[PDB]
Structure 1
Amino acid sequence: ELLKPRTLADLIRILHELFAGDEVNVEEVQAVLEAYESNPAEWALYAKFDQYRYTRNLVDQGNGKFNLMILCWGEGHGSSIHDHTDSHCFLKLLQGNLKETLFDWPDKKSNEMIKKSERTLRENQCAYINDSIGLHRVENVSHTEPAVSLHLYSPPFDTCHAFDQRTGHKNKVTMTFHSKFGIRTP
């Protein structure tokens, strides 16, 4: 029984219900994320930016079942091309816009990774990715507007791979949290 989340706190409560079991109804999770109307006052505590790159701000650890985090993208900040470590990954825009570029998994042959598609994710929209869909890069291409996004990963993961667009070669990278539960974590 999916009801509209009234607030971020209500969304979190609903997510704990949707992840109470061992499987994930992706379409329901995506729908409830989309239905939460971003309210900046509710997530200001987590919106901690860094001047030089995007930050990852942990909001909730789920039932051990998921990481819910807010990513804060300064103007021009973007990610590597990366995978999602065999997890579901949902990305909902809370403020601004992000460009998502999709790539196929590289072949063993060292070649340039050519994008398969791109799209512009707009405020309140929720995208979904997993490794079977492909790899992606997420960018705030704005020169004037920060972006803020709400990400949910299940199962949680703390490492992923970055892919070199020139060759397809990958390297393992550990996620660092800029803050946890509103507290800066140097």
Structure 2
Amino acid sequence: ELLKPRTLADLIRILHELFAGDEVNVEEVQAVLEAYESNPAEWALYAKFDQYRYTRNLVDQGNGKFNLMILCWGEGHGSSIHDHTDSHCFLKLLQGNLKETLFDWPDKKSNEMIKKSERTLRENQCAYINDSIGLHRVENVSHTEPAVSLHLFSPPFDTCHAFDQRTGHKNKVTMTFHSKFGIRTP
């Protein structure tokens, strides 16, 4: 029985319930993530920016089955084209806008990766992806507004691949946390 999260803290408790079992109900998780109305005061602690690239800020370690983090995107900051390591990825906008560009898994042959589609995620919207769906790139294309997003991954993962848009070639990346629980972690 899914209720509206009243606050970020509330959202986290609900996520522990949802992941209390071995199976994820994706539409339910996406629904509750969406239902949370972004309140900048609730997550300001986690919203730590870097001048040159986007940052990953851990919010909750989950119950072994997931974790939850906040990503902060300066003007013009974006990601690589990437996968999600056989895990669920949920992404919700907390501030600003992000452009999400979808790509298919590349064939063996070296080829331009052509955009399958793109969309603009606006404040409070929650997107979902997993490897069965495809790959994506996420970008703050604004010249004037920073962006902030909330990401839920299940199971947790700290590695993934980046794909070269010219060739489809992948490289394994290890991701780092800019902060954990509000604390900068160099």
Short-chain TM bin: over 0.9
- The 2-side partners of 1:108 and 1:66 are apart by 32
- The 2-side partners of 1:4 and 1:177 are apart by 29
TM superposition shift of 1:131: 0.5
What is the count of residue pairs matched by the alignment?
186
Quick check: 1:31 aligned with 2:31? yes
Indicate the SS of the match to 1:13.
helix
TM superposition shift of 1:67: 1.5
String of CA shifts for 1:51-96, please: whole Å, max 9, x gaps: 0000000000100111200000000000000000000000000000
String of CA shifts for 1:17-54, please: whole Å, max 9, x gaps: 00011110000000000000000000000000000000
- The 1-side partners of 2:135 and 2:35 are apart by 26
Indicate the SS of the match to 1:144.
coil
Query: TM-score of the superposition, structure 1-length normalised?
Result: 0.99
Structure 1 outlier segments of 4+, above 2 Å: none
Which segments of 5 or more consecutive residues in structure 1 lack a partner in the other structure? none
- The 2-side partners of 1:63 and 1:156 are apart by 10
- The 2-side partners of 1:111 and 1:75 are apart by 30
Which segments of 5 or more consecutive residues in structure 2 lack a partner in the other structure? none
Give the percent of matched residue pairs that are identical in Structure 1 and Structure 2.
Answer: 99
- The 1-side partners of 2:119 and 2:29 are apart by 21
Q: CA RMSD in A?
A: 0.4
